[PDB]
């Protein structure tokens, strides 16, 4: 099974630098042409960089040429994107993508992405509050964090049925907030324990909140 | 750059009917008898996934209801008959010339029968009130269509300017949406009042539904 795993994203000041990594497994990495593709907050997809399986030949769009460097370490099965003189418009989810062998004319595998935020705003961890409860509803309010993203699970990933984690909303303050909710049998309220697990990696925040 | 323009930007199609999405390129993507336009599907929280490559070829593992056509500057993705799991955003992408470019995406909504929301209201927690802020939450669960009116009332007075809404992406199984509306008050303001009510108007509701609590 082919797998690509991006890492290294984070919050960077405008004008700063950051290097992303993509760990490749399940195929002969050296035989493949590889690209980075990013997706802006507006959901626009932008090809960012390409490195061929031959000659270390690299290609870039004019928007990043001179600031971004793609490279590869075939012995360690790793792809890299070094970014410098970063701009607000570079804020995006960054994906590692493999080109179909031979004709190389489409992306046949992608990683799950790593998030880059270019901003002068400070990191802020979330506050997690309970939404306390036929069917009953309950949940967790994840409020006032920056930057995106946050992850929310229930009972460590055992409880997924009936779970809705809402897209974050940007408040006028510049901080994000979201809720995660779950519906359960109102009879199970007495016996069953419900814990929301919140992760905000940019602030090193891991919280479990019992509802 | 070869700028790609998709139309429409969003599309709603009944179950079992045909979805047609177009992509126009600013210059031709033909080379030596093939046309280098790809189509990708993207679902929330996932990377895009290729469905069609070089205008008309299905990727291995793709259902037969998907097909691609066109050449030069004009391409079409067809889905027929659409299924619930086809709710997604679809992107075209040209590979004829560097830089590779993507269209802006078309979101496909799958139409279903009207489904009324189940409505829930949540008071602010004691913990948060300590911070001097009160967030009151109203949940509208598993409804269709997306259009809904959520009004906050406080001691029966209509609120404006102090709430925000968030809506889930369409469910891949049953084609519904859920929605949250959060009302944000100061502690002082919150404690000035007794009755907090969320009133919901929706096509599936025989009349507006109010959920409320007393502080
Ligand atoms: C592009 O294709 C669609 C149908 O495939 C059609 O409606 C439209 O007229 C075409 N545009 C041109 C310029 O041929």
Residue numbers in the entry:
A (entry chain H): 1 to 133, 141 to 218
B (entry chain L): 1 to 215
From the reporting publication:
15 The R136S Christchurch mutation is located in the domain involved in the interaction between ApoE and heparan sulfate proteoglycans (HSPG) and in the binding to the low‐density lipoprotein (LDL) and LDL receptor‐related protein (LRP) receptors. ApoE4, a major risk factor for sporadic AD, has a stronger binding to HSPGs, whereas the protective variants ApoE2, ApoE3Ch, and ApoE3 V236E (Jacksonville) bind less avidly to HSPGs. Therefore, modulating ApoE‐HSPG interactions might be critical in promoting resistance to AD‐related neurodegeneration. Here, we developed and characterized ApoE‐Christchurch‐inspired antibodies (referred to as anti‐ApoE‐HSPG or anti‐ApoE‐GAG antibodies) capable of inhibiting the interaction between ApoE and HSPGs by using recombinant constructs of the HSPG domain of ApoE and ApoECh; we purified monoclonal antibodies and confirmed they competed for heparin (a type of GAG) binding and confirmed their ability to reduce ApoE‐derived cytotoxicity in vitro and tau phosphorylation in vivo.
We first synthesized peptides corresponding to the N‐terminal HSPG‐binding region (amino acids 114 to 144) of WT ApoE3 and ApoE3Ch variants. These peptides were used to induce an immune response in mice. We followed standard procedures to obtain hybridoma cell lines secreting novel anti‐ApoE antibodies with high specificity. We sequenced the CDRs for the monoclonal antibodies to identify specific amino acid sequences responsible for binding. CDRs for all four antibodies have about twice as many of the acidic amino acids aspartate and glutamate (D, E; 10 to 12 amino acids) compared to the basic amino acids arginine, lysine, and histidine (R, K, and H; four to six amino acids), a feature that may be critical for interactions with the positively charged HSPG‐binding domain of ApoE. 30 Light‐chain (VL) CDRs are almost identical among all four antibodies regardless of their binding for ApoE WT versus ApoE3Ch, whereas heavy‐chain (VH) CDRs are highly distinct, suggesting that some VH sequences may be critical for selectivity. None of the newly designed antibodies showed any binding to mouse ApoE compared to anti‐His tag antibody used as positive control. Using binding assays, we confirmed that the library of antibodies differentially targeted the different ApoE variants, thereby offering a novel platform for targeted therapeutics.
